[PDB]
């Protein structure tokens, strides 16, 4: 029952997203708001109006997200952010910068420097699969970009001294036993938030607003970055907070990346997707059919219904489902089939595109070059 | 009386330089050993034979030294290393890599990132003045090179995780109040010690020996670098330890970089050089002329005589001076005049060359490019 997201906004001191804001965004774009905005999926921001101010006056801004490279599969939750960011991008016709923290993984996990980089490239393919207009998005490897940016490291250093060790010990719990690469990394994570880190596309000029869509329990991490922003004469990056995408087995967790099952993977096949949802997707319906008819299912805790909230685009069909499962008219198996019919095409479509992404294609995304926007 | 350099070799576990080694170096080069080697100025090494092995078999090696950029003047002591390294370079016809730690200064001192860089460029002019064959030496700014080396940062990261925070807390005494840029810097200092950090001149290949001439109280700093060397499949860099160049006012200190006087600066004029030596260069002679004749001067503590040890190239003239000052035949004013006649031309010659170094000249030294050697 510890789901409260409004009591969450309060303690972090961020701002709730209201109708005002969504309409302002829809007017600014001439488009219909994303369902993530309609349903309270992405409910908080930090300076989103500032971002809109800029856009309305024809003053550009850019978006920045990252991914911690890995070997395991890569699931559906990993898409919430990438999906919202693809919308925002297309909707505003704006530049997207994507950080592949191979160095972080190399520092934290047990990889070979050449390994972590490997993942950064492969994981890049999964990210391209989501569409992302090539003439608008730049995907970089920390390990690769550092040594080919006349502005990235410069910004790391500026951030590196304005952040004490104590500041990170109380935010990532670093210990005297941790390597020096770890203690100093939070700066690498922060740097892309400032426009001149990418001269190849903005040239000098630090007047460009950055927008970072991310999870809400990731806010106390961008505090640091936002605090040391004007302290170094740079604009604070705008945030857009999203809720937690639950793990099949329950909503108590957000679970893993291992524990096979527990997460629909982008590599799972139609059969596999079907199995995981029917067998593991936690059910909020009753145990017997008669008890389910009498009392109905509980939509709040049902994982299969939650997933629908994310991937079912029709607002009306979702409300029908919500209503009938609650009354008992619809049974969890029916809910499951609904979800399965939305996930199979989605995941399979991803598989299709991920096949169309060559090497001469990734090379181009990773090649720092010029782009298109306002 | 705390001068003991042999009791110093013992506690650090390094190796004394003997005749064997000097002859091996003189045979390897077909040249007469430098006076720094003849007089026990540079008396310790770590793997210098390995370096010679390589050179004899026609297998190249390279040299690496650095300088912490600054605004003040830049004195004669700052030359011991640069002088020895110019010899070694010319004598072996080998590549020299020079680190301008502007980022370090920006982190530690109170500069503007753009300031520290300024110094790196100016201080570069002083370093070029010493000769250094352009087609053999590469001078880089940490701030500039980082963002234009497909191998430098890669090596920083490799070093960054093999060195804990505790390892540096007990070597540079870092505290939880120090910024994260500081804690992680020792890696930036170490990286140039490995050949593939500079692909523009060695391309891949990490089989190239690095030699680092430096002070002997700087050994417990290169321990770290040498320890994490094979731990990452890289050759340990060779050292060549030198003694302390004393400060005019006494040998108790090595004194400063401020306290005007106390150090002959490369900007000092002939008049100024003459004044500082006569007025401040600590004297080991007696107070009265009669007492000086009877007991003689003490060469061990006389700073003016010590300076001669460094800059007077003739071994015979130096022994004459040593003998006569000790017996009392020569008076401290005569010793002073001797030193002054060696320093005025040396420092003035530097001034002359430092004027001949243009901007299209520094640009070329700083431009990572190809060089010449074995």
Curated annotation (Swiss-Prot), chains A, B:
GO function term, MF aspect, one: protein kinase binding
Record EC number: 6.1.1.2
Reaction(s) catalysed (UniProt annotation): tRNA(Trp) + L-tryptophan + ATP = L-tryptophyl-tRNA(Trp) + AMP + diphosphate + H(+)
Coiled coil segments of this chain: none
Post-translational modification Phosphoserine, affected residues: 256
Record's note on what induces expression: By IFNG/IFN-gamma.
Protein keywords: Aminoacyl-tRNA synthetase, Angiogenesis, ATP-binding, Cytoplasm, Intellectual disability, Ligase, Neurodegeneration, Neuropathy, Nucleotide-binding, Phosphoprotein, Protein biosynthesis
Residue span of motif 'KMSKS' region: 254-258
Intracellular or extracellular location(s): Cytoplasm
Record-listed N6-succinyllysine modification sites: 59
One GO BP: angiogenesis
Posttranslational modification: Proteolytic cleavage generates 2 forms; T1-TrpRS and T2-TrpRS.
Function comment: Catalyzes the attachment of tryptophan to tRNA(Trp) in a two-step reaction: tryptophan is first activated by ATP to form Trp-AMP and then transferred to the acceptor end of the tRNA(Trp).
Disease: Neuronopathy, distal hereditary motor, autosomal dominant 9: A form of distal hereditary motor neuronopathy, a heterogeneous group of neuromuscular disorders caused by selective degeneration of motor neurons in the anterior horn of the spinal cord, without sensory deficit in the posterior horn. The overall clinical picture consists of a classical distal muscular atrophy syndrome in the legs without clinical sensory loss. The disease starts with weakness and wasting of distal muscles of the anterior tibial and peroneal compartments of the legs. Neurodevelopmental disorder with microcephaly and speech delay, with or without brain abnormalities: An autosomal recessive disorder apparent from early infancy and characterized by global developmental delay, delayed or absent walking, impaired intellectual development, poor or absent speech, and postnatal progressive microcephaly. Additional variable features include cortical visual impairment, seizures, hypotonia, spasticity, and sensorineural deafness. Brain anomalies including myelination defects, cortical atrophy, or thin corpus callosum are present in most patients.
Name used for this protein in its record: Tryptophan--tRNA ligase, cytoplasmic
Residues of the full protein shown: 96 to 469 of 471
């Amino acid at each position: 029952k510890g789901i409260d997201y409004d009591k969450l906004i309060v303690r972090f001191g961020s701002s709730k997203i209201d109708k005002e804001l969504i309409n302002r965004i829809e007017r600014a774009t001439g488009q219909r708001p994303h369902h993530f905005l309609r349903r309270g999926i992405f409910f908080s921001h930090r300076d989103m109006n500032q971002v809109l101010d800029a856009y309305e006056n024809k003053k550009p801004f850019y978006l920045y997200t990252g991914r911690g490279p890995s070997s395991e599969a890569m699931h559906v939750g990993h898409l919430i952010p990438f999906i919202f960011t693809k919308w925002l991008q297309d909707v505003f016709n704006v530049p997207l910068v994507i950080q592949m923290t191979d160095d972080e993984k190399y520092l934290w996990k047990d990889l070979t420097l050449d390994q972590a980089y490997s993942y950064a490239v492969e994981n890049a393919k999964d990210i391209i699969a989501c569409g992302f207009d090539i003439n608008k998005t730049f995907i970089f490897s920390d390990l690769d970009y550092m040594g080919m940016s006349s502005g990235f490291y410069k910004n790391v250093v500026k951030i590196q001294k304005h952040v004490t060790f104590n500041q990170v010990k109380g935010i990532f719990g670093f210990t005297d036993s941790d390597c020096i690469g770890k203690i100093s990394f939070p700066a690498i994570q922060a740097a892309p938030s400032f426009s001149n880190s990418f001269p190849q596309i903005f040239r000098d000029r630090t007047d460009i607003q950055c927008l970072i869509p991310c999870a809400i329990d990731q806010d106390p991490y961008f505090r640091m970055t936002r605090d040391v922003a004007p302290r170094i004469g740079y604009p604070k990056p705008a945030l857009l907070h999203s809720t937690f995408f639950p793990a099949l087995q329950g909503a108590q967790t957000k679970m893993s990346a291992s524990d096979p099952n527990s997460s629909i993977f982008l590599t799972d096949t139609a059969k596999q997707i079907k199995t995981k949802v029917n067998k593991h997707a936690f059910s909020g319906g009753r145990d017997t059919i008669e008890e389910h008819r009498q009392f109905g299912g509980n939509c709040d805790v049902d994982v299969s219904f939650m997933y629908l909230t994310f991937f079912l685009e029709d607002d009306d069909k979702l409300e029908q489902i919500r209503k009938d499962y609650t009354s008992g008219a619809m049974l969890t198996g029916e809910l499951k089939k609904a979800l399965i019919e939305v996930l199979q095409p989605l995941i399979a479509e991803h598989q299709a595109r991920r096949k169309e992404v060559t090497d001469e294609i990734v090379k181009e995304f990773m090649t720092p070059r010029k782009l298109s926007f306002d």
